[PDB]
């Protein structure tokens, strides 16, 4: 598909220009914090089942509307559905974070996503609740501000990674809208 190392080529050959020492300061400072991205993403793979369990349990916390009988998502077949329908996009936002590029969602999992979900009858207010609380927990989880899940790192600033993951989250949050 595509990467941050690739969309620098797609605008370069859109101009027939060089790739070289004009975007290069972003390029070496991309890979200067590659270990910082690795310091982020192994925290993400640590509690992924806890991530999706927190997401679905908070969705029953301030919404009982799905678990209403005869509602949208009140069957264990449909909780297995938003088992999948949460976890595989968590896989995909991990893929966008390892690529450093948002080119692996709308081509990949949102190929006409919400049109098929309206064909399934999925209400969007549940969806925007799901992606927002998973957004807020994922920015809590890239840093070491958990309950006591205090992994060891080298200390310093890493808020560029928070602006990274939130950009992927409102990209998916708008494209599910």
């Amino acid at each position: 598909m595509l990467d941050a190392f690739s969309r620098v080529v797609v605008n370069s050959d859109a101009k027939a220009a060089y790739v070289g020492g004009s975007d290069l300061q972003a390029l070496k400072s991309f890979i200067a914090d590659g270990n910082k991205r690795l310091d982020a993403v192994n925290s993400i793979v640590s509690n992924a089942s806890c991530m999706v369990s927190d997401a679905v349990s908070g969705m029953i916390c301030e919404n009982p509307g799905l678990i209403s009988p005869g509602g949208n998502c009140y069957t264990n077949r449909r909780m297995a559905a938003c088992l999948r329908d949460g976890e595989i996009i968590l896989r995909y936002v991990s893929y966008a974070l390892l690529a450093g590029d948002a080119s692996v969602l709308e081509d990949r999992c949102l190929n006409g996503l919400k049109e098929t979900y309206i064909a399934l009858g999925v209400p969007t207010n549940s969806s925007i609740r799901a992606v927002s609380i998973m957004k807020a927990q994922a920015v809590a989880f890239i840093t070491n501000t958990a309950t006591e899940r205090k992994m060891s790192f080298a200390a310093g600033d890493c808020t560029s990674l928070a602006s990274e993951v939130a950009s992927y989250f409102d990209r998916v949050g708008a494209a599910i809208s």
């Binding site: 595509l2 990467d3 690739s6 080529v9 890979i31 590659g34 690795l38 993403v41 992924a48």
Partner: protein, 164 residues
């Protein structure tokens, strides 16, 4: 567009599974070696206007019969689009330098290699001979280091092994 990193996410698609340590040290090699890769490409952009006049004109030194019509170089406009051809040749080897993977080789030079100038009646023997000038045309204490020039050689000779 294939990279190393693209192959292991598609490996995690072929698994359908989680990013383990199949991933987690392929990137750390790029912390060493892609930092040891990038430094050539400025003189590759710096020589890009002059590697054409050595290589394509040495292929004219190879192939000079082209005056007759029904052949390829029967006018000089064909000769300056030879220059336009090999312009994008080292521009693409600049590209598959900086990605590492063979995606800009494969889908962008090799997808449409075996038949295209066959039907367009042009030999790839000059397309391999100009780059056969640039085989050992490099200097590992002197042009750049010995840590990426053999890999640069490996880049554009995988190109020729694909072309052959």
């Amino acid at each position: 567009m294939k990279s190393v990193i693209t192959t292991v996410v598609s490996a995690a698609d072929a698994a359908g599974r989680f990013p383990s340590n199949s991933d987690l040290e392929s990137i750390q090699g790029n912390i060493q070696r892609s930092a040891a890769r990038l430094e050539a490409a400025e003189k590759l952009a710096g020589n890009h206007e002059a590697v054409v006049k050595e290589a394509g004109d040495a292929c004219f030194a190879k192939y000079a019969y082209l005056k007759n019509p029904g052949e390829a170089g029967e006018n000089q406009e064909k000769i300056n689009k030879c220059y336009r051809d090999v312009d994008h040749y080292m521009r693409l080897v600049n590209y598959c330098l900086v990605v590492g993977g063979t995606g800009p080789l494969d889908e962008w030079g090799i997808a449409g290699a075996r038949e295209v100038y066959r039907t367009l009646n042009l030999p790839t023997s000059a397309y391999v001979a100009s780059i056969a000038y640039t085989r050992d045309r490099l200097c590992v204490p002197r042009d750049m280091s010995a840590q990426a020039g053999v890999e640069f050689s490996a880049y554009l000779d995988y190109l020729i092994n694909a072309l052959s």
